[PDB]
RNA sequence: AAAAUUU
RNA sequence: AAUUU
């Protein structure tokens, strides 16, 4: 029936110039050697991406879908949710959000400039006066950085971003933000994945696994999920939004946004030309995560019931999920997962890689991460969250005139502090760099390097500084990724760390704490690391 | 471009 | 600001 896109033939123009790396990457040329592998997806590649995501959809629902959907509205109606004052919505706008076509940008919106506020008022009138006229959208390519992978293609084509003018974005917020805050949690309960910390993901997954007499797990992801979303799916999304308690004024705006923005519309490139027309999810709308998550959750629970999955326990973050089920023997488990996949495909959410049942928690990847295990100080098992380091290390090497990766380094250090690759590689480099710069004191992205031991303990527990005997998988994968990027192997990082440490210690102060906590793995005679007053 | 988490 | 979807 519905085609996901149609294309005029107009280019997908760049929204400003997309920078090149330089001949010298001074911050990262001691991190790794193979900078030729580190690239940023350009708008040149956008054409290819479109070809991949433009395709015909044929949804076919059934009793299981219909029944799940029913249950989800009886959930929805316990939610009452309100409008957001034009002002409050303006306040929620990000500081650097792309400026409006009508001569104002996010400074003005957040500072409640008069021109901005009027224009927004008029936009919201038109939403109320008019529930059919399609709202124009802009289409741009996303700039992510990756390592090349000649296994899976050379270089990925750029993801497509589709969004309305800033005025419309504010209005969306007025109508829906409150919903986004309440609905999913209400509908999916514990299954709603974006509620949890990394640590709670891990505990949740473990509680799940442990509760089964004979657990079986698997993950699923949908291929180009946004383009698999059907006009109908979106309307079904609306009909769930509506199922709450709502100011009549909302309903009108929601319904109006649904029909004018969410189910489709014309797309324009940055140069102004008509680019195509869209009949699936737009990436750049307020409802994207909520939508994806809810919709994916419906289809998945339906597919679960179709396929026979016993005692499923789910976790959903957008198009990504994990189900931990009672195993029905491998012969049947293989059969049920085929069924699941057929069902999902009938619902128009077919997978990239077909899923597979697994019976070891380390072998289930989702949202690009997984659970692994190591031993802590007293010799007990410690489960934690990790991931292939390839991309993090690639992004660690993205240095241009505009961009510096030092923030990225730190970002990953915090999120993945217990991982062997953060502890041995990133930390070591990060500190080594700042000691030489002599810029330990400086707060980066509103965080101070010398707090780190505190911040990590607060978040990952003290065992994060004492962990050892990492898993085969994890050692194999780290080593492999360092070779791939032309980085020194771990033995070399051991050396560099020892040096960084001694130097950190000798400097004394909050420094020497860092030296002693963060790098205790690096030394022959370990130390009695005790809790830190701060967290 | 949007959200969530982390800070 | 970091990461993810
Ligand atoms: C565009 C999506 F709908 C996308 O289709 C969906 C699923 O994410 P995934 O990373 O699996 O990518 P695809 O499924 O290939 O789109 O999540 C949304 N998404 C993703 C990446 C992103 O920077 N922003 C975003 O809004
Ligand atoms: Cl322990
Ligand atoms: Mn996907
Ligand atoms: Mn309606
Ligand atoms: Mn995904």
Cα-to-centroid distance, A238 and ligand 4 (Å): 7
Total number of domains constituting chain A = 2
**Is A507 found in the same domain as A398?**
yes
Cα-to-centroid distance, A280 and ligand 5 (Å): 16
Indicate the top mutation candidate among A230, A319, A391 to test ligand 1's pocket, ranked by most ligand atoms within 8 A of CB.
A319
**Is A532 found in the same domain as A510?**
yes
Q: Which of A306, A339, A368 is the last residue of a domain?
A: A368
Three-state SS at A468:
strand
Three-state SS at A278:
strand
Three-state SS at A426:
helix
Cα-to-centroid distance, A360 and ligand 2 (Å): 22
Q: Distance (Å) from CA A459 to C1' B6?
A: 9
**Is A138 found in the same domain as A14?**
yes
- Contact (Cβ atoms closer than 8 angstroms) between residue A422 and residue A410: no
If residue A239 lies in a helix (H) or strand (E), which one and from where to where? helix A231-242
Q: Distance (Å) from CA A9 to C1' B6?
A: 41
- Contact (Cβ atoms closer than 8 angstroms) between residue A310 and residue A328: yes
Protein residues with C-beta less than 5 angstroms from the ion ligand 4: A 255
**Is A386 found in the same domain as A345?**
no
Protein residues with C-beta less than 5 angstroms from the ion ligand 3: A 221-222, 225, 319
**How far apart are the C-alpha atoms of A167 and A171, rounded to whole Å?**
7
**Is A336 found in the same domain as A269?**
yes
**Is A399 found in the same domain as A325?**
no
Which nucleotide is closest to the Cα of A163 by its C1'? B1
- Listed in order, strand segments (DSSP E) in A129-232 are 137-141, 145-147, 160-163, 215-220
Q: Which residue is nearest to nucleotide C1 (CA to C1')?
A: A445
* Residue numbers of the domain that contains A437: 369-535
- Count Cβ atoms below 10 Å from residue A197 Cβ, excluding itself: 11
What's the sign of the alpha-carbon dihedral A498, A499, A502, A507? Answer: negative
Residues with CB under 7 A from strand B: A 92-94, 96-98, 142, 161, 163, 169, 173, 177, 180-181, 194-198, 283-286, 288-290, 414-415, 445-447, 451, 455, 458-459
Resolution in A: 2.9
Protein residues with C-beta less than 5 angstroms from the ion ligand 5: A 221, 319-320
- Count Cβ atoms below 10 Å from residue A65 Cβ, excluding itself: 22
**Is A410 found in the same domain as A361?**
no
Ligand 1, atom 15: nearest CA belongs to which residue?
A224
Q: Which residues of A define the annotated binding site for Mg(2+)?
A: 221, 319-320
**How far apart are the C-alpha atoms of A187 and A296, rounded to whole Å?**
12
What's the CA angle centered on A139, arms A119 and A175, to 5 degrees? 40
Residues framing ligand 1 (Cβ under 6 A) = A 221-222, 224-226, 281, 283, 288, 292, 318-319
Q: Which of A349, A368, A387 is the last residue of a domain?
A: A368
**Is A289 found in the same domain as A406?**
no
**Is A164 found in the same domain as A71?**
yes
| The pair of three-digit structure tokens given for residue A403, joined into one six-digit string | 């961009």
**Is A375 found in the same domain as A344?**
no
Distances in Å between the Cα of A178 and the Cα atoms of A120, A171, A429, A495 are 19, 12, 42, 52
Nearest CA-CA partner of A185 in A324, A367, A366, A316 = A316
**Is A363 found in the same domain as A401?**
no
Instruction: Give the number of residues written for chain A.
Output: 535
**First-to-final CA distance of chain A:** 56
Give the method used: X-ray
SS3 content of chain A, % helix, strand, coil (to 5): 50, 15, 35
Which nucleotide is closest to the Cα of A96 by its C1'? B1
**How far apart are the C-alpha atoms of A3 and A6, rounded to whole Å?**
7
Rounding to the nearest 10 degrees, give the CA dihedral for residues A434, A440, A444, A446.
160
- Contact (Cβ atoms closer than 8 angstroms) between residue A413 and residue A421: no
**Is A267 found in the same domain as A409?**
no
Q: Distance (Å) from CA A493 to C1' C4?
A: 27
Helix, strand counts (H, E) of chain A: 20, 12
Cα-to-centroid distance, A224 and ligand 3 (Å): 5
Determine if strand C comes within 7 Å of the CB of A445: yes
- Contact (Cβ atoms closer than 8 angstroms) between residue A249 and residue A128: yes
Q: Which of A345, A368, A391 is the last residue of a domain?
A: A368
């Amino acid at each position: 029936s519905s085609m996901s896109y149609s294309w005029t033939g107009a280019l997908i123009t760049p929204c400003g110039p997309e920078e090149e790396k330089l001949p010298i990457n001074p911050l990262s040329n001691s991190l790794l050697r193979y900078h030729n592998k580190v690239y940023c997806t350009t708008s040149k590649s956008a054409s290819q991406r479109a070809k991949k995501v433009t395709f015909d959809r044929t949804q076919v629902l059934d009793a299981h879908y219909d029944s799940v959907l029913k249950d989800i509205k009886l959930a929805a109606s316990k939610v009452s949710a309100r409008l957001l004052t034009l002002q409050q919505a303006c306040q929620l706008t990000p500081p650097h959000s792309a400026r409006s076509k009508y001569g104002f940008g996010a400074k003005e919106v957040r500072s409640l400039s008069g021109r901005a506020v009027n224009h927004i008022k008029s936009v919201w009138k038109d939403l109320l006066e008019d529930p059919q006229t399609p709202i124009p959208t802009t289409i741009m390519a996303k700039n992510e950085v990756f390592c090349v992978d000649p296994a899976k293609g050379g270089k990925k084509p750029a993801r497509l971003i589709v969004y309305p003018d800033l005025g419309v974005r504010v209005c969306e917020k007025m109508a829906l933000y409150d919903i986004t805050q309440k609905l999913p949690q209400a509908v999916m309960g514990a299954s709603y994945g974006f509620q949890y910390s990394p640590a709670q993901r891990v505990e949740y997954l473990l509680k799940a696994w442990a509760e089964k007499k004979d657990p079986m797990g698997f993950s699923y992801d949908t291929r180009h999920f946004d383009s698999t979303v059907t006009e109908r799916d979106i309307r079904t999304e609306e009909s769930i939004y509506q199922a709450c308690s709502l100011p009549e004024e909302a309903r009108t705006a929601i319904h109006s946004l649904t029909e004018r923005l969410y189910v489709g519309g014309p797309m324009f490139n940055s140069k102004g030309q008509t680019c195509g027309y869209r009949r699936c999810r737009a990436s750049g709308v307020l409802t994207t995560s909520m939508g994806n998550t809810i919709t994916c959750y419906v289809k998945a629970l339906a597919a679960c019931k179709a396929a026979g999955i016993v005692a499923p326990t789910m976790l959903v973050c957008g198009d990504d999920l994990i189900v931990i089920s009672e195993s029905q023997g491998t012969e049947e488990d293989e059969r049920n997962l085929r069924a699941f996949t057929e069902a999902m495909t009938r619902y128009s959410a077919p997978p990239g890689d077909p899923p597979r049942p697994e019976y070891d928690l380390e072998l289930i990847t989702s949202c690009s991460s997984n659970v692994s295990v190591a031993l802590g100080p007293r010799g007990r098992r410690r489960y934690y969250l990790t991931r292939d380091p390839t991309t993090p290390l690639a992004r660690a090497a993205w240095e241009t005139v505009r961009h510096s990766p030092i923030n990225s380094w730190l970002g990953n250090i915090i999120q993945y502090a217990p991982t062997i690759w953060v502890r041995m590689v990133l930390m070591t480099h990060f500190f080594s760099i700042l000691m030489v710069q002599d810029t330990l004191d400086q707060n980066l992205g509103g965080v101070n390097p010398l707090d780190l031991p505190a911040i990590i303990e607060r978040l990952h527990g003290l065992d994060a500084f004492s962990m050892h005997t990492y898993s085969h998988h994890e050692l194999t994968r780290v080593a492999s990724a360092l070779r791939k990027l032309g980085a020194p192997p771990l033995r070399v990082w051991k050396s560099r760390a020892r040096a960084v440490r001694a130097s950190l210690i000798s400097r004394g102060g909050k420094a020497a704490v860092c030296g002693r906590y963060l790098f205790n793995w690096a030394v022959k005679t370990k130390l009695k690391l005790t809790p830190l007053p701060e967290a």
